């Protein structure tokens, strides 16, 4: 019995047979569904490694050659003697792309084949991590013509502490907790802001202060590195027809570079492996600026637009959000920085699902994350049933290192 | 942590554990390997469903273990013993109906669950009589615009003997006429039932908003056709509070949403005809019904009137039009004095319901994809609330179409 998956807008049906290859577990059982939840030996490492080596040789269509068997022997010999093994650059490149491809929450996977992979496994200090991170940013930003990248730092080792980037993204704005309860800047970054200050960073007092990085080499206290302002491209927000909107002094950074997830390839774990593509506009316009526990600017905007704030039924919240998202798109386009709107992103994801159906017999997708945060049923993904499951290589959550 | 699903609200940072889900009788469609949450779709067996139900009834009047409780159990097993089935006391039926609603994971209006008028119609014995009960239900629920939640219950499934069925999916629905050019006039969701009404002798209209007749089936009989008298069907013409031309589009919606094709299951007993109605939340009309591409699909038309750039996704024309359509729905209903609730007020009230149910029952089964509204999602507090979905009984369940 395999999942029948229906698109309700077109009446079409597919069957997901790729989920059979799931060896990892989602949070659900048959007695209760936990899907909307945001967070969750050597022959076993070996069996994940053989499997991953199998994927890789199949990918280059050498699925049986001398090379294939000799490579499995290498991996077997290395695990038998040392309890672990190492990946070849080109396996690593293939694993990273496959991790992205398999990421159920990513709407931008049409892009999965085009990922610049920086091998930083020859990295031995916080200082080197920083240099690599700077290269990553410079490459990925590309004066606003954004390019997808990942930089992979040295894998976890049974002996020692992990390499980690303590920040959750490479670029984030500071959130300064007030004694009077409230937050100046981004409330989601209060804890990382506090951490930075105590490892000796001099704070600013703005709404949009770019945080320094805390980089940790194994079993060493993390170190502080301030990003060179010229590396951090930012887009001031204005609105195409509302002149007052610019007066709000809103801005956002160009580069979304997630730096806290663990990358897992054939049983090996890469605890520092920051990755970036480009923003979908609703991430900034709806979530970051309008979430009540984020910058929460909807009321400010509604009042400027002169809307009736006293009642939910004037749909003031909805009207303001739409203008905010429009401002984000307009500003990014004016500054010539890559962005995709939620309509174009979901249309391309549909094409991706279809590609994936033909190529693998299904696609892991997390509906609550693929459907955008405004205008859901106005996008084709709303009407598309979706099956969520964990394939490996995978990006996974890991504990905060402090 | 305790050994139960942990549930987080990401706006407020708060945690709860669902203990209620451990009372779940029915498997959902998920396994450890794969999540199917986004998907839209006897002897001792009866006795134990019955027993469990009667226990629920006695708890809710706080007489668990009492002699009246043990006598009812005995009465129910004896009745099953001799007939294969049993019957509910009136007050059990009322409790089971409210509890089915309360249990419904997809319903965001459940803060209202305790206030349901239960019309007992288990004496009903003909299609004509279904019609009278249905008309009575509509008059009572509609209440000239001040809507009142209600359910009418017809006789339960009975061994061998045929079912009572309402063929229509709601008591009030608009016709969908399949055109020569292959397109649809009216509501494309209603094509099959439209065509069925024609097959059974209905003389079809040709409007975009033709109210369907009812096709009602008493046991072992072909369905009979009944035309609702127009004046029982309240409708709201749509206008916009500032865009004057919107009224000129001639759009309208009916006031009463009355789902009629679901099965109400109580203590193993099956009520195959049990239509229920509340009032609308505005996004069901303004977003789904009017803007779904496979429904009325009016988004482009509205956007063109609003002079928006429809050649490019990045103008947000879809988003701007959809907002105005929802504002029109809200505004028109308020002007016509017909009950309606917006998706902000609804979700707030549903957060409050979740909190009540946390204290009362230790959880609340909720289907996130259906609870979050189809526009402005993360603008509502339910978006940031994790939810656990499972089936409790009494339940409203899907059932195959009678044909
Ligand atoms: C190319 C442009 C891309 C776009 C437009 C995009 C879009 C998105 C969006 C909207 C999300 C949901 C994230 C959130 O709401 O916080 C997401 C999640 C994610 N994407 Fe992408 N993505 C892109 C590229 C990438 C790349 C290059 C990778 C890695 C190689 C990646 C891996 C992920 C992962 C692992 C998640 C889940 C993050 C989490 O669980 O918090 N994506 N993507
Ligand atoms: C009192 C006002 C009510 C409101 C605002 C309301 C709101 C809603 C909404 C928005 C849905 C989603 C339906 C869809 O997207 O098609 C729904 C589903 C549902 N509601 Fe309500 N509801 C109300 C009253 C009722 C009543 C009185 C009952 C039954 C006694 C009920 C039982 C249901 C059930 C069973 C569903 C699921 C239907 C399905 O799965 O297709 N609700 N509710
Ligand atoms: N486009 C990506 N690679 N996104 C990953 C998540 C970024 C996150 N949504 C943010 O608002 O900053
Ligand atoms: N409020 C209710 N009882 N809703 C049941 C669903 C009605 C359906 N969404 C409609 O728009 O016609
Ligand atoms: Zn699930």
Cα–Cα distance between A353 and A357 in angstroms, integer?
A: 6
Nearest to B370 by CA among B176, B105, B126, B132: B105
From A74's Cα to the closest Cα of chain B, the distance in A is 31
Q: What is the DSSP string of A15-63?
A: E--SGGG--S--S-BTTBB-TT-S---HHHHHHHHHHHHHHHHHHTT-T
- Which domains are assigned to chain B? 18-122+149-159+263-277+347-371 (3.90.340.10), 123-148+163-234+398-402 (3.90.440.10), 235-257+280-345 (3.90.1230.10)
Cα–Cα distance between A273 and B71 in angstroms, integer?
A: 67
Residue B91, H or E segment: helix B90-103
Nearest to A19 by CA among B40, B41, B368, B31: B31
Print burial letters for B187-221: b (CB count within 10 Å at least 16), e (below 16).
bbbbeebbbbbeeeebeeeeebbbbbbbbbbbbee
- Is the C-alpha dihedral spanning B372, B376, B377, B381 positive or negative? negative
Q: Which residue, among A315, A370, A392, would best test binding to B if mutated, counting the most B CBs under 10 Å from its CB?
A: A315
Q: By the 8 A CB rule, do B285 and B325 touch?
A: no
Q: If you measure from the C-alpha of residue B32 to the centroid of ligand 5, how many angstroms do you get, rounded to a whole number?
A: 9
Q: State the DSSP code for A231.
A: G
Cα–Cα distance between B224 and B389 in angstroms, integer?
A: 38
Nearest to B105 by CA among B170, B8, B40, B60: B40
Roughly what angle, to the nearest 10 degrees, separates helices A89-101 and A42-59? 90
Q: Locate breaks in chain B with C to N over 2.5 A; list the residue preceding each.
A: 41
Neighbours of A81 (CB within 10 A): 9
Cα–Cα distance between B298 and B301 in angstroms, integer?
A: 5
Binding residue per annotation — B280?
A: yes
Cα–Cα distance between A232 and A226 in angstroms, integer?
A: 11
> How many residues in total does chain A contain?
402
The contacts of residue B164 (CB under 8 Å, 6+ apart) are: B124, B130, B154, B155, B217, B218, B219, B272, B273
Tell me if B389 and A35 make a contact (CB, 8 A cut-off): yes
Q: By the 8 A CB rule, do A374 and A286 touch?
A: yes
Whether A283 is catalytic: yes
Between A and B, how many residue pairs show a Cβ–Cβ distance under 8 A?
208
In terms of DSSP H, where are the helices of A316-395? 316-335, 342-360, 367-370
The contacts of residue B309 (CB under 8 Å, 6+ apart) are: B315, B317
| Contact A240/B at CB under 8 A | no
Residue carrying the six token digits 């094509």: B191
Residue B320's Cβ-side half-sphere holds a number of Cα atoms within 13 Å equal to 21
Catalytic option among A100, A252, A278, A316? A278
Task: Identify the three-state secondary structure at position A322.
Answer: helix
Q: State the DSSP code for B362.
A: S
Residue A256, H or E segment: none
Roughly what angle, to the nearest 10 degrees, separates helices B44-60 and B90-103? 90
Task: Identify the three-state secondary structure at position B241.
Answer: coil
| Contact B28/A at CB under 8 A | yes
Nearest to B119 by CA among B275, B298, B246, B303: B275
Residue B291, both tokens: 């803007």
Neighbours of B335 (CB within 10 A): 12
Cα–Cα distance between B399 and B403 in angstroms, integer?
A: 11
Cα–Cα distance between A231 and A255 in angstroms, integer?
A: 10
Resolution as reported, in Å: 2.3
Nearest to B363 by CA among B1, B40, B5, B3: B5
Tell how many helices (H) and how many strands (E) occur in chain B: 11, 18
Task: Identify the three-state secondary structure at position B310.
Answer: coil
Q: By the 8 A CB rule, do A308 and B331 touch?
A: no
Tell me which residue in B320, B342, B386 faces A322 most closely, judged by beta carbons: B320
Nearest to B165 by CA among B227, B201, B222, B218: B218
Q: By the 8 A CB rule, do A313 and B334 touch?
A: yes
Residue B105's Cβ-side half-sphere holds a number of Cα atoms within 13 Å equal to 23
Tell me if A329 and B314 make a contact (CB, 8 A cut-off): yes
Residue B65, both tokens: 């273990």
Residue carrying the six token digits 């994801």: A349
Nearest to A350 by CA among A37, A38, A17, A9: A9
Task: Identify the three-state secondary structure at position A233.
Answer: coil
Cα–Cα distance between A149 and A208 in angstroms, integer?
A: 25
Cα–Cα distance between A276 and A391 in angstroms, integer?
A: 20
Q: By the 8 A CB rule, do B228 and B215 touch?
A: no
From B221's Cα to the closest Cα of chain A, the distance in A is 32
The contacts of residue B89 (CB under 8 Å, 6+ apart) are: none
Q: By the 8 A CB rule, do A215 and A166 touch?
A: yes
For A24: left if phi > 0, alpha if psi spans -120 to 50, otherwise beta; the answer is: beta
Q: By the 8 A CB rule, do A32 and A16 touch?
A: no
Tell me which residue in A16, A30, A388 faces B27 most closely, judged by beta carbons: A30
Nearest to B96 by CA among B55, B132, B68, B131: B55
Tell me if B35 and A26 make a contact (CB, 8 A cut-off): yes
Q: By the 8 A CB rule, do B378 and A287 touch?
A: yes
Tell me if A378 and B37 make a contact (CB, 8 A cut-off): no
User: What is the dihedral angle through the alpha carbons of B313, B318, B319, B322, rounded to the nearest 10 degrees?
Assistant: 180
Q: By the 8 A CB rule, do A75 and A84 touch?
A: no
For the Cβ of A395 lying below 6 angstroms from any atom of ligand 1, the answer is: yes
User: What is the dihedral angle through the alpha carbons of A179, A182, A188, A193, rounded to the nearest 10 degrees?
Assistant: -30
Q: Which residues of B touch A317 (CB under 8 A)?
A: 344, 376, 379
Q: By the 8 A CB rule, do B53 and B44 touch?
A: no
For A48: left if phi > 0, alpha if psi spans -120 to 50, otherwise beta; the answer is: alpha
Burial of A40 (0-12, 13-18, 19+ CB in 10 A): exposed
- List the beta bridge partners of residue B206: none
For the Cβ of A287 lying below 6 angstroms from any atom of ligand 3, the answer is: yes
Residue B322, both tokens: 């959809």
Percent composition of chain B: helix, strand, coil (DSSP 3-state, to 5): 40, 15, 45
Residue A102's Cβ-side half-sphere holds a number of Cα atoms within 13 Å equal to 22
Longest alpha-carbon distance in chain B:
72
Q: If you measure from the C-alpha of residue B372 to the centroid of ligand 1, how many angstroms do you get, rounded to a whole number?
A: 22
Cα–Cα distance between B112 and B149 in angstroms, integer?
A: 8
Give residues 280 to 319 of B whose Cβ lies within 8 Å of A. Answer: 287-288, 291-294, 299, 313-316, 318-319
Q: By the 8 A CB rule, do B339 and B244 touch?
A: no
Cα separations in angstroms, B377 against A33, A320, A345 = 20, 14, 17
Q: What is the DSSP string of A116-176?
A: EEEE--S--SHHHHHHHHHHHHHHHHGGG----EEEEPPPP-SSSPPPEE-SSBSS-B-EE
Q: By the 8 A CB rule, do B232 and B209 touch?
A: no
Experimental method: X-ray
The contacts of residue B106 (CB under 8 Å, 6+ apart) are: B367, B370, B371
Task: Identify the three-state secondary structure at position A365.
Answer: coil
Query: What SS3 string covers B165-201?
Result: EECCCECCCECEEECCCCCEEECHHHHHHHHHHHHCC
Q: What is the DSSP string of A194-227?
A: HHHHHTTPPP--SSSPBPPEEEE-TTS--EEEPP
Cα–Cα distance between B346 and B329 in angstroms, integer?
A: 15
Cα–Cα distance between A169 and A113 in angstroms, integer?
A: 23
For the Cβ of B370 lying below 6 angstroms from any atom of ligand 2, the answer is: yes
Q: By the 8 A CB rule, do A357 and A365 touch?
A: no
Nearest to A177 by CA among A151, A155, A154, A198: A198
Binding residue per annotation — B291?
A: no
Cα separations in angstroms, B238 against A280, B22, B249, B288, B367 = 34, 46, 8, 16, 31
Residue A303, both tokens: 């009042």
- List the beta bridge partners of residue B150: B117, B277
Cα–Cα distance between A205 and A376 in angstroms, integer?
A: 36
Whether A19 is catalytic: no
Residue B40, both tokens: 């839209």
Cα–Cα distance between A350 and B307 in angstroms, integer?
A: 28
Residue carrying the six token digits 């770019």: A210
Cα separations in angstroms, B300 against A383, B188, B319, B321 = 18, 17, 11, 8
User: What is the dihedral angle through the alpha carbons of B122, B123, B126, B131, rounded to the nearest 10 degrees?
Assistant: -70
Give residues 343 to 372 of B whose Cβ lies within 8 Å of A. Answer: 344-345, 348, 368-369, 372
Neighbours of A111 (CB within 10 A): 16
The radius of gyration of chain B's CA atoms, rounded to the nearest angstrom, is 23
Residue A328, both tokens: 């984000």
The contacts of residue A374 (CB under 8 Å, 6+ apart) are: A282, A286, A318, A321, A322, A325, A342, B319, B375, B376, B377, B378, B379
**Any idea which residues of B carry the catalytic annotation?**
107, 110, 279, 284
First CA to last CA distance, chain B: 50
Cα–Cα distance between A301 and A303 in angstroms, integer?
A: 5
Tell me if B291 and A375 make a contact (CB, 8 A cut-off): no
Tell me if B389 and A33 make a contact (CB, 8 A cut-off): yes
Residue B380, both tokens: 């509502």
Longest alpha-carbon distance in chain A:
73
Catalytic option among A283, A290, A316, A356? A283
The radius of gyration of chain A's CA atoms, rounded to the nearest angstrom, is 22
Question: Residue A130's Cα: distance from chain center in Å?
Answer: 20
Percent composition of chain A: helix, strand, coil (DSSP 3-state, to 5): 40, 15, 45
Residue A396, H or E segment: strand A394-396
Neighbours of A297 (CB within 10 A): 18
Residue A398, H or E segment: none
Residue B264, H or E segment: strand B263-266
The best mutation among B278, B294, B371, B397 to test binding of ligand 2, ranked by most ligand atoms within 8 Å of the C-beta, falls on: B278
User: What is the dihedral angle through the alpha carbons of B274, B279, B283, B288, rounded to the nearest 10 degrees?
Assistant: 30
Nearest to A349 by CA among A324, A325, A383: A383
């Amino acid at each position: 019995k395999f999942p029948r998956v229906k698109n309700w807008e077109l009446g079409s049906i597919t069957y997901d047979t790729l989920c059979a290859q799931s060896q990892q577990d989602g949070p659900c059982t048959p007695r209760r569904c936990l899907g909307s939840l945001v967070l969750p030996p050597a022959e076993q490492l070996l069996s994940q490694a053989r499997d991953f080596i199998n994927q890789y040789y199949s990918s280059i269509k050498r699925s049986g050659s001398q090379a294939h068997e000799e490579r499995l022997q290498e991996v077997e010999a290395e695990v038998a003697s040392t309890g672990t093994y190492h990946l070849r650059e080109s396996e690593l490149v293939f694993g990273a792309k496959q991790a992205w491809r398999n990421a159920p929450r990513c709407v931008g996977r049409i892009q999965w084949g085009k990922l610049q992979v920086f091998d930083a496994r020859d990295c031995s200090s916080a200082q080197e991590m920083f240099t690599y991170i700077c290269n990553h940013i410079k490459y990925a930003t590309n004066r606003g013509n954004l390019r997808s990248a990942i930089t992979v730092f040295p894998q976890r080792a049974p002996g020692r502490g992990d390499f980690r980037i303590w920040n959750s993204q490479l670029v984030r704005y500071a959130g300064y907790r007030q004694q009077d309860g409230s937050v100046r800047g981004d409330p989601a970054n209060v804890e990382i802001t506090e951490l930075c200050i105590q490892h000796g960073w001099t704070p600013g007092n703005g709404r949009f202060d770019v945080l320094p990085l805390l980089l940790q080499a194994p079993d060493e206290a993390p170190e502080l590195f301030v990003l060179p302002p010229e590396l951090v491209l930012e887009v001031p927000l204005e609105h195409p027809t509302l002149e007052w909107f610019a007066a709000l002094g809103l801005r956002w950074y160009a580069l979304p570079a997630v730096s806290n997830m663990l990358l897992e390839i054939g049983g090996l774990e890469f605890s520092a492996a920051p990755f970036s593509g480009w923003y979908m506009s609703t991430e900034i316009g709806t979530r970051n600026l309008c979430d009540p526990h984020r910058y929460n600017i909807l009321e400010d905007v509604a009042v400027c637009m002169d809307l009736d704030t006293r009642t939910t039924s004037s749909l003031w919240k909805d009207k303001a959000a739409v203008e905010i998202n429009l401002a984000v798109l307009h500003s990014f386009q004016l500054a010539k920085v890559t962005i995709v709107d939620h309509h174009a992103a979901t249309v391309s994801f549909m094409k991706h699902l279809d590609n994936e159906q033909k190529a693998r017999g299904g696609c892991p997708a997390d509906w609550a994350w693929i459907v955008p945060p405004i205008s859901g049923s106005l996008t084709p993904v709303f009407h598309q049933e979706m099956v969520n499951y964990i394939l490996s290589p995978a990006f996974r959550y890991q504990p905060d290192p402090w």
